[PDB]
């Protein structure tokens, strides 16, 4: 049974998400323009930088997250940012043509755009697999936002100090998600849905590793690093 507190948590996360994800994509006009070697890196760096900011905003509204210290908050966002972007991006992702469609042609991103930002199939293939696997869970929006929150608040991120506290915050979110699934997700789509959602978080850790290794490479080239944003540099190092 969903306690009143569990329902409150869900309502908070739904609203935190509505406040930080603008499904009109109007802000995308302000980025450096997409150009179609690393022709998409300026635009995609702007896109990611913008979304890091939204993710930080979302994190701040996660019940329990502001009980954390600044350090722990920073550490969780530093390690989770790229993962949460991948997760949240599932909302624009379309299987019709395995692209992220943000309202117009200019802001329709496919695998070729992703390679024009310096990535290879090392990232691109598990990323598309991930988006398609996520899309196939047909998550309720309640499940989607709970999974983003669970992703951010993980006690095993590198740098975490008060792991017991991060773990208690994450437990309350997991128990809420497990309970939501049981009470509100009909079979057959509920079938081991929890375990499947957790598998997607394991897939994100893997994508994060790929991200880091490629980012480390791209960094040792100051001419490319110069095209990033100050936020991206601070968050990804």
């Amino acid at each position: 049974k969903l306690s009143e507190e569990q329902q409150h948590i869900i309502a908070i996360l739904l609203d935190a998400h509505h406040k930080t994800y603008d499904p009109t994509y109007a802000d995308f006009r302000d980025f450096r323009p997409p150009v179609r070697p690393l022709s998409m890196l300026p635009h995609l760096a702007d896109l990611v930088s913008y979304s890091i900011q939204k993710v930080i905003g979302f994190a701040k509204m996660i019940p329990g997250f502001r009980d954390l210290t600044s350090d722990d908050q920073i550490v969780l966002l530093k390690s989770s940012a790229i993962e949460v972007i991948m997760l949240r991006s599932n909302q624009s992702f379309t299987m019709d043509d395995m692209s992220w469609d943000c309202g117009s042609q200019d802001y329709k991103y496919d695998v070729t755009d992703v390679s024009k930002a310096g990535h290879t199939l090392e990232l691109i293939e598990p990323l598309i697999k991930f988006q398609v696997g996520l899309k196939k869970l047909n998550l309720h929006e309640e499940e989607h936002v709970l999974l983003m929150a669970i992703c951010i608040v993980s006690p095993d991120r590198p740098g975490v100090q008060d792991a017991k506290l991060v773990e208690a915050i994450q437990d309350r979110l997991s128990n809420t998600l497990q309970t939501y699934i049981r009470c509100r997700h009909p079979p057959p789509g509920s079938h081991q849905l929890y375990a499947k959602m957790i598998q997607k978080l394991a897939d994100l850790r893997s994508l994060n590793e790929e991200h880091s290794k490629q980012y480390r490479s791209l960094s040792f080239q100051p001419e490319n690093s110069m095209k990033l944003t100050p936020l991206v540099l601070e968050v990804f190092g």
Partner: peptide, 10 residues
Amino acid sequence: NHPMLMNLLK
């Protein structure tokens, strides 16, 4: 040392 991230968290 994370001034911008720190600032977005405040």
